[PDB]
Design a protein around this ligand. Sequence first.
Ligand code: VO4
Ligand SMILES: [Cl-]
Lengths: 458, 458
Amino acid sequence: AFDFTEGNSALEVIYPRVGPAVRKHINQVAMDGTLVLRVSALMESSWFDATAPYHPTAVGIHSDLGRRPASEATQKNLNTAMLYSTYRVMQSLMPTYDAQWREMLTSVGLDPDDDSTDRTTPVGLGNAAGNAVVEKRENDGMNQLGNEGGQKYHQRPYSDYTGYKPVNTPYDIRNPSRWQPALVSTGNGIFTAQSFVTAQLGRAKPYSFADPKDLLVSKPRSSNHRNRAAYKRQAEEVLRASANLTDEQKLKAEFFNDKLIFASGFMGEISDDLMEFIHSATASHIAGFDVMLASWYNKRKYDAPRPFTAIRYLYAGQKLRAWGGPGKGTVDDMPAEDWQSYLQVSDHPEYPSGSTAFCAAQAEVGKLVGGGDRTDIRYDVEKGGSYIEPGVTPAKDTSIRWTDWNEMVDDCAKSRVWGGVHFKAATEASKGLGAKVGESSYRYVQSHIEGKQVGSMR
Amino acid sequence: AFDFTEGNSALEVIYPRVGPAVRKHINQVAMDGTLVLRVSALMESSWFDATAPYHPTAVGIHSDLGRRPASEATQKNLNTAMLYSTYRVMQSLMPTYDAQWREMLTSVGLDPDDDSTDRTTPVGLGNAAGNAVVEKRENDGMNQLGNEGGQKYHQRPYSDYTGYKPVNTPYDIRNPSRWQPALVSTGNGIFTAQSFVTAQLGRAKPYSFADPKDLLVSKPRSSNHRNRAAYKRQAEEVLRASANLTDEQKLKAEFFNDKLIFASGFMGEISDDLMEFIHSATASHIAGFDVMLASWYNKRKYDAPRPFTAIRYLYAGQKLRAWGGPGKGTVDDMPAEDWQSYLQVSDHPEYPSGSTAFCAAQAEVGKLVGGGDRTDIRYDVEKGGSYIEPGVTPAKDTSIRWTDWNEMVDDCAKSRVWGGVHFKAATEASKGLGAKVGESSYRYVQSHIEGKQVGSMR
Ligand code: VO4
Ligand SMILES: [Cl-]
């Protein structure tokens, strides 16, 4: 029931199956940007590579698959290349979802046992393109296969092979100027301590630049607790934002915090030309992948503490005015040792903000695609639809709209402070960081579009 | 499709629903004894109190609910009382399964909104009995409500309020004489450190004795890493068990490691008389709850290291002849820092063995109820039905049978060493512990059946 000649296989066949799998596999809140954006970058650049011969000049990022006559550039042909290259990438990234990927193909009539690599057919181009992405990314340094350092047994995808250790335990703040893992429980009586997710990411191969070394942000000096005044001030800002939350801040925090929810507000930016959609989506999420890698390089270098670690340190034995938790509204007697961010604070150091650097990179790419600051980004949440306070937030039906790329970025920054997971400085540093990677990935893909292979993916 | 006059509530209506809910909520492997056995003891002791008025002399544990004419001691009325007590206990322990517990009652024709407490009706007796269990057990020191210590906000069920902290880190063995959390991943890209599950349990209120502190087991002198000779030998045992695993060892390890699959081996041990079934279950799983509690008191007291910790310390930098991981059979090049137990090692200190102490308790109640060492424990697994090596173990359909309670207890104790999760010493200590607790639970239940209230559970 999909129209190869007129539909968009991404929006109608691929996304409806890959989004849910990602939530089922990784996290119900699509919160783990280095995992979801690896899927996102790898899948969609495989679209770019699988359909490059149907463009007048484009060459692929991971493969050089030649040229086809412009008359073969049918909607059906692009769609078919897309579905097969997705198939190979997802079979590499999420093998335990083998059945789901086969069904992705068979539900639209294609055969998942067709492993042809004929560069004259859209199935061969899809297969060749997806296999090339998989061959170039399985051992890119992120440890997708848990084999780095010659590990033959008990392989765990994306395990850290680089020996990162935190200097605080989840139970003792030994160093308030350094990251501390949070103790977390889903509510079933099991408790676990966070572990720096994809701590090795900083060593993985980027797309649009050679080394994250050259995207170093400045030291987060307000997070040096010996700078007593600036350290206490940013913590006071996080407590005020917590104490003063509005429904709209809560939701804007929830929006920018879930990458799938975030992308779902973009259906007003989508071109009607399939090739255009592919080229924009490739630059967008190559920017996302690369900015996450730059963010994680920075995050590991500075190893900065999340707000709760500062609030616990500064306000020990005290009771704070803050958000009281689901359905409690603001309270005056939050014990500092129980205080939580509104959002669940993620499993990595605080500085800078990965979500914000992805917002900024995406807006940089957005501007370069549409020529100006104009956009149309939308989020609609029914009464009680919040995923932090279901049944309480928002109190009434809510529509949030952005029409300027910059104001959206600014809100995304603000929202991590409202969310409780970042100090102001992290979000500010991520604006310039995202801007740079978003332009560099735009120029990287645009070069390839224009027939110029650049970089070292091949 | 349930016959109130001839069927069994537990086996036909309740267990097929509570079991799968316990797997969804807590763990696909029913391996977290302190939470499974809380559900087990509280549900079934609620049965015992629901139906005690229908026995000529029985008085309840958490309530005194009077006496019913012998003419009313019908199967129909027992089942009805069981279902309503269960309803109130599950609504307390697992409130997010509201729809499941409601459907548990509507599916055999009962109104989940019947509030009645009329002690002349099976409905009111069930409600009253379950309400009493709930009122006595919500604030028993297990911190089910997350409220201990006056915590009003961000309540997490069963969170520790007693300040347990490990002296080891997931990433560094400061002290090989003390417990170390494992770093664990579901295959997800996400990684978390274990936290001592229900570290507070030693403080909670037991059934059949006042205080676990009178139930201490011997000092584990071989888990002291400076007593070098003895420390090494027991690690060497665990390695040799790992290297020399066989399909039957593997399957017994799995059998005693999953509390629900263990309970599945007891089919030829159910009474036909429904009242007799409630009384044996109550003795059995009050025995389990009380041996969990005493085990945890000892685990916390001794804070002993798991085998993987000692192996990593002793054989740092070497390769080992061990189990290679799923489908790998035995290999000679397992790096020490990669060695894992066959079972997934549990999130609590090593000494003594909770599963064995449960096995030993369950076997003691079975003796006192059955008149001696004779029993009928069966466990069948189709080819490839392992949950550690799905599709590899076992080769060939396998049947395992125990006829002697003591044989079963020795196999459980041995299975934890085959499993890689315990040293021998911990599994031997649990025998004396489980015998004592199983006995005191049986005598504690037996007194209540006979009409003599004992203890402080009212
Ligand atoms: O549940 V155990 O204490 O035998 O690892
Ligand atoms: Cl900067």
